[PDB]
Write a protein that binds this ligand. Structure first.
Ligand SMILES: *[C@@H]1O[C@H](CO)[C@@H](O[C@@H]2O[C@H](CO)[C@@H](O)[C@H](O)[C@H]2NC(C)=O)[C@H](O)[C@H]1NC(C)=O
Ligand SMILES: *[C@@H]1O[C@H](CO)[C@@H](O[C@@H]2O[C@H](CO)[C@@H](O)[C@H](O)[C@H]2NC(C)=O)[C@H](O)[C@H]1NC(C)=O
Ligand SMILES: *[C@@H]1O[C@H](CO)[C@@H](O[C@@H]2O[C@H](CO)[C@@H](O)[C@H](O)[C@H]2NC(C)=O)[C@H](O)[C@H]1NC(C)=O
Ligand SMILES: *[C@@H]1O[C@H](CO)[C@@H](O[C@@H]2O[C@H](CO)[C@@H](O)[C@H](O)[C@H]2NC(C)=O)[C@H](O)[C@H]1NC(C)=O
Ligand SMILES: *[C@@H]1O[C@H](CO)[C@@H](O)[C@H](O)[C@H]1NC(C)=O
Lengths: 106, 87, 49, 50
């Protein structure tokens, strides 16, 4: 409706008997392949991304936002737990870091 | 008596090809192809994204994936039967 | 015979995703007419002078 | 094919040109509508074989 791509903003310009809209949009570019999984199995529990997606570069698993590649460590802060690992089809095994663990470890 | 019918610029096979391209883009890439380059995504993950769009968590889609697929297939068959059976 | 578009077979598989690593800020133009010339015709003067 | 009818028809002016122009505009409008509705992608995507 407001240009090709994900719409960011628009600017109006007057024209003889008309209007010209300059649509400023965000277009994704330079995409890269990654191996993906619906959920991460850790401690017999299924972890799902709170806002992002699980990606793998070949050896390690990360969670990133869907529209830009920004890999982050899979923690309890950006994932949520619902059920065990026996129901979700295609769940893979990976560790889930806990931020609270070094606090009581020290 | 001077009446002529001009053929359409797009023939039926080309329009079908356009619909096929749109179907392939929306199945294999979701909504990414409409906003830029087509980015591949698995279809259950795409359905989970759509579920998140309407305010339902991903777990609900993943746990009940077989039921959702069965319901979708049944609905598509009912659509074909309804179109074939209604004048 | 016209070609609809270049063929682009998307490499779909059940466990692979494509994630963008960059972005382009694209500005596009959309031209919409708003008004016409306001024309008035005097019917008596046009038909009869 | 009547020459006399065409000669009398010429007295009325450019009515025929107006009607032909309007029909031509409708005919191109239909093609424009089909382009707008269906030709929204410039890549012909195809499904995987499996
Ligand atoms: C992601 O991987 C797929 C397949 O592993 C790549 O698709 C192939 O790309 C090569 C390079 O041009 C083509 O010759 C093949 O025909 C493609 N295969 C299919 C099925 O389309 C794809 O290019 C990769 N994408 C990225 C961003 O690396
Ligand atoms: C996937 O990304 C991770 C994170 O960067 C890579 O792990 C690093 O690899 C480099 C080079 O082998 C090491 O120097 C770093 O110490 C690693 N970091 C961690 C936290 O392990 C990993 O190698 C990448 N995988 C591939 C196949 O490229
Ligand atoms: C992911 O981890 C689970 C649990 O650690 C693995 O399930 C075990 O699989 C072995 C081998 O078949 C069985 O003997 C155990 O009884 C299973 N344990 C449970 C709790 O189910 C699972 O195989 C792992 N998957 C992968 C791909 O490594
Ligand atoms: C993302 O793309 C932009 C281009 O839009 C890249 O910016 C270019 O970077 C090169 C090398 O540093 C410069 O020579 C160009 O002048 C830059 N272009 C502009 C418009 O500034 C950017 O580096 C890319 N980023 C990644 C991570 O690939
Ligand atoms: C993807 O399909 C292959 C077989 O084609 C299967 O072995 C694999 O488990 C599937 N992965 C997922 C996540 O469904």
């Amino acid at each position: 409706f407001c240009g090709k791509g994900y719409h960011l903003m628009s600017f109006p310009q007057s024209a003889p008997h008309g209007v010209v809209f300059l649509h400023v949009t965000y277009v994704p570019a330079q995409e890269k392949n990654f191996t993906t999984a619906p959920a991460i199995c850790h401690d017999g529990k299924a972890h799902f991304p709170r806002e992002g997606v699980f990606v793998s570069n070949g050896t390690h698993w990360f969670v990133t936002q869907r529209n830009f590649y920004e890999p982050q460590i899979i923690t309890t802060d950006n994932t949520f737990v619902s059920g065990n690992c026996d129901v979700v089809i295609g769940i893979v095994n990976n560790t889930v870091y806990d931020p609270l663990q070094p606090e009581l470890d020290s | 008596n001077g009446l002529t019918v001009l053929p359409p610029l797009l023939t039926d096979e080309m329009i079908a090809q356009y619909t096929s391209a749109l179907l392939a883009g929306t199945i294999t890439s979701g909504w990414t192809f409409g906003a830029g380059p087509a980015l591949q995504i698995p279809f259950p993950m795409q359905m989970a994204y759509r579920f998140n769009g309407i305010g339902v968590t991903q777990n609900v889609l993943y746990e009940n994936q077989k039921l959702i697929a069965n319901q979708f297939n049944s609905a598509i068959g009912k659509i074909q039967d309804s179109l074939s059976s209604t004048p | 015979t016209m070609s609809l578009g270049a063929e682009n077979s998307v490499a779909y598989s059940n466990n692979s995703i494509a994630i963008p690593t960059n972005f382009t800020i694209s500005v596009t133009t959309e031209i919409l007419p708003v008004s016409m010339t306001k024309t008035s015709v005097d019917c008596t003067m046009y038909i009869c002078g | 094919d009547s020459t006399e009818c065409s000669n009398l028809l010429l007295q009325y002016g450019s009515f025929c040109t107006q009607l032909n122009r309007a029909l031509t505009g409708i005919a191109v409008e239909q093609d424009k509508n089909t382009q707008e509705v269906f030709a929204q992608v410039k890549q012909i995507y195809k499904t995987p074989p499996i």
